[PDB]
Design a protein around this ligand. Structure first.
Ligand SMILES: N[C@](CC1c2ccccc2Oc2ccccc21)(C(=O)O)[C@@H]1C[C@@H]1C(=O)O
Length: 756
């Protein structure tokens, strides 16, 4: 119907919708000053203060073509064509559109004519296609940045398992996608993700609260929701007598109005709000205008029908205006496009203060791709009192500043918002103004998985949801290799206290206590006392010293074998070397053999004689060497050990033993000896032995006795292959006992009537 033109030399158009939503008999709706006058004036204001300030080229006035807009996309396109017709004097850019649908259709047309645009309250939900949208930008940052801020807030408080709720529309979907992308980048698991809105009614709002409340692994409701829909969730929360921490978009607006009716829903909730900074000059200019006399803006007459109770009797100054962030953005926007034109004038009309024909074709041809994008311009025409920029980057983007509030139980009044901090470039907060997180008060409820593992728990658990990483205890034969696993260190190696290393089954010998005062540790070193002294008795009693060892030994080899029995047994407890394995096979092998062999040999001489010492001895010794040489070959081919590692799941090792299965390596020597002992008793049928006494008494008593003793230990010695400990006494006793039994019976008859 009308265009609010402004006289000037160069003209910018715009869209600050006057009217809202209409119906079947109405082209569009009622007039609304929060879309209309407070923004229509913001541009007209800026244009004249721009026209007066020398930061614009001083001889060129910027006029206007403000489109007769309604908050409708269809309407905006039909009207936008008027800019196109003006440009086929003409339009050098358009500032306006209070909704993304208004901005998009106007821009869809204008881009084709190389005319740039500025938009408000529009988002990346649709305005992300820079391949076309580099022609224009928002002054108002897109809503999705708040979703990024939400993810940052949540990670800063270590909320890593959260519930995402967003509005039923495009705002909501955009917020969810942006949130989830940032949330994953920050290692935040999103426990739930859903849309809400007034359309689903109250039962559904309770259903949403119950969906999280009845699954309280997360305890924060992250709301990328417009104000009305948020109010219905908060009401549901109180109807259900419960609350969640809420983390909120600019749809909470820093306003008690979205909350306080169900204020208990929200205590300690955090809201991102779109930052707002006054220009006192507009508020003063604007509030002080009186269009009843000031012809600048005729659309006031329609707004006045409701602002004033009729009609010029009521001056404009009688009724106040809201100093909205929308004003700040519209004023700033005009300042940016104006300073882009200032640079465009220098670029196209460098020689004057007036216009040149170079700018007569629309200069939009150079503005949209350059001059209106590179616009921070170091805060030209004096914007809001940050004075930091108009906006930066402008890759379809607006300012990007957001403040952070919290909703506090100011119970002396109603629960209230207070300034915690801000985001914009990054998150800054006083957590003490957040009783959610405040020192010595903040419960930081749940909303993370039990990720920490016991230091002794490794195997990774992903119980359906990989978000909750849990651990399984390490098998104690393995050690920690990584956070999610143990490595096998060999079974005989169990994890150590170091976690990442292992405990080796130790090796040790003395396990015999008081109950074992009769064990190897006392046998091996004491049994010797019964026999080794004997050789000195013989020296005192060696009646024929004239006989050399080569013939003398015929009656001493047996004593030698007895003494060796004890010597070996002692070493077997005392010396944790290869020497013990070596000796169990080699020294012990004759120590016990001699105790029977010497007597078998004597017995057969007796059997042949009754009913030349050099050869008698050489034979007695040859019969001993014959077994030692088997063992030497064994020792050379199969070298002796110390430890005897086995049964690694539990077993301590000794260091004083063969690592070999012993079995027959000691066994066949022991069995040759048993057979010798029994052969002697057979040979003894010839019971006749005169030598000082009838020795038939003593050799009988001796061998009947030792044929029981040797035989007595063989059932253990060559059998209990499963044991680790009895063998020590099996050997200590069997051999040392045979030792004292034979001299104590054979030599003792003489030995102690002389040593009497
Ligand atoms: N459609 C939105 C609505 C956006 C908004 C902008 C200007 C004026 C009112 C207003 O309403 C809210 C309420 C909460 C969050 C964002 C907004 C848009 O106009 O750009 C935007 C997509 C996001 C959404 O759906 O929620």
């Amino acid at each position: 119907k009308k265009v609010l033109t402004l006289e000037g030399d160069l003209v910018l158009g715009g869209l600050f919708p006057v009217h809202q939503k209409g119906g079947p008999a109405e082209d569009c709706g009622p007039v609304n000053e929060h879309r209309g006058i407070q923004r229509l004036e913001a541009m007209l204001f800026a244009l004249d203060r721009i026209n007066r300030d020398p930061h614009l080229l001083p001889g060129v006035r910027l006029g206007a073509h403000i489109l007769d807009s309604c908050s409708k996309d269809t309407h905006a396109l039909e009207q936008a064509l008027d800019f196109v017709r003006a440009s086929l004097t003409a339009i050098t850019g358009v500032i306006g559109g209070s909704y993304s649908d208004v901005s998009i259709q106007v821009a869809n047309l204008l881009r084709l004519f190389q005319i740039p645009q500025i938009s408000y309250a529009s988002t990346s939900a649709k305005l992300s296609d820079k391949s076309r949208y580099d022609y224009f930008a928002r002054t108002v940052p897109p809503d999705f940045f708040q979703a990024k801020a939400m993810a940052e807030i949540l990670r800063f408080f270590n909320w890593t398992y959260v519930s995402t709720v967003a509005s039923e529309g495009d705002y909501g979907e955009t917020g969810i996608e942006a949130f989830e992308l940032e949330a994953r980048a920050r290692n935040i698991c999103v426990a739930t993700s859903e849309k809400v809105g007034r359309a689903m009614s109250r039962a559904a709002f309770e259903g949403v609260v119950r969906a999280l409340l009845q699954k309280p692994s997360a305890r924060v409701a992250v709301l990328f929701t417009r104000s009305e829909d948020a109010r219905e969730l908060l009401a549901a929360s109180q109807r259900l007598n419960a609350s969640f921490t809420w983390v909120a978009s600019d749809g909470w607006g820093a306003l008690e109005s979205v909350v306080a009716g169900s204020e208990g829903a929200a205590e300690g909730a955090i809201t991102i709000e779109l930052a707002s900074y006054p220009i006192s000059d507009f508020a003063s200019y604007f509030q002080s205008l009186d269009p009843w006399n000031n012809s600048r803006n005729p659309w006031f007459r329609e707004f006045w029908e409701q602002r004033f109770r009729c009609c010029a009797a009521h001056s404009l100054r009688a009724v106040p205006f809201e100093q909205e962030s929308k004003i700040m953005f519209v004023v700033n926007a005009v300042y940016a496009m104006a300073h882009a034109l200032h640079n465009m004038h220098r670029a196209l009309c460098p020689n004057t203060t007036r216009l040149c024909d170079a700018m007569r074709p629309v200069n939009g041809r150079r503005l949209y791709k350059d001059f209106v994008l590179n616009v921070k311009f170091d805060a030209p025409f004096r914007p809001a009192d940050t004075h930091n920029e108009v906006r930066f980057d402008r890759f379809g983007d607006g300012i990007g500043r957001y403040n952070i509030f919290t909703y506090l139980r100011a119970g002396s009044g109603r629960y209230r918002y207070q300034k915690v901090g801000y985001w914009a470039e990054g998150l800054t907060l006083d957590t003490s103004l957040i009783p959610w997180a405040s020192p010595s008060a903040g419960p930081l409820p749940a909303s993370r998985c039990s990720e920490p593992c016991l230091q002794n728990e490794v195997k990774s658990v992903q119980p359906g949801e990989v978000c909750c990483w849990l651990c399984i205890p390490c098998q104690p034969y393995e050690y920690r290799l990584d956070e999610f696993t143990c490595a096998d260190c060999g079974l005989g190696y169990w994890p150590n206290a170091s976690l990442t290393g292992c405990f080796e089954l130790p090796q040790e010998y003395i396990r015999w206590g008081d109950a074992w005062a009769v064990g190897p540790v006392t046998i091996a070193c004491l049994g010797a006392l019964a026999t080794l002294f004997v050789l000195g008795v013989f020296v005192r009693h060696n009646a024929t010293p004239v006989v050399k060892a080569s013939g003398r030994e015929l009656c001493y080899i047996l004593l030698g074998g007895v003494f060796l029995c004890y010597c070996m047994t002692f070493i077997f407890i005392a010396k944790p070397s290869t020497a013990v394995c070596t000796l169990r096979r080699l020294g012990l092998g004759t120590a016990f053999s001699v105790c029977y062999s010497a007597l078998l040999t004597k017995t057969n001489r007796i059997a042949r004689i009754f009913g030349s010492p050099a050869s008698q001895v050489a034979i007695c010794l040859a019969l001993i060497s014959g077994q030692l040489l088997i063992v030497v070959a064994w020792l050379v081919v199969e070298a002796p050990g110390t430890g005897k590692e086995t049964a690694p799941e539990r077993r301590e090792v000794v260091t004083l033993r063969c690592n070999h299965r012993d079995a027959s390596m000691l066994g066949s020597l022991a069995y040759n000896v048993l057979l010798i002992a029994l052969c002697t008793l057979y040979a003894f049928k010839t019971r006749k032995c005169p030598e000082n006494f009838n020795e038939a008494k003593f050799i009988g008593f001796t061998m009947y006795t030792t044929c029981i003793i040797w035989l007595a230990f063989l059932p253990i010695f060559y059998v209990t292959s499963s044991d680790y400990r009895v063998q020590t006494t099996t050997m200590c006793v069997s051999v040392s006992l045979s030792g004292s039994v034979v001299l104590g019976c054979l030599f003792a008859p003489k030995l102690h009537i002389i040593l009497f």
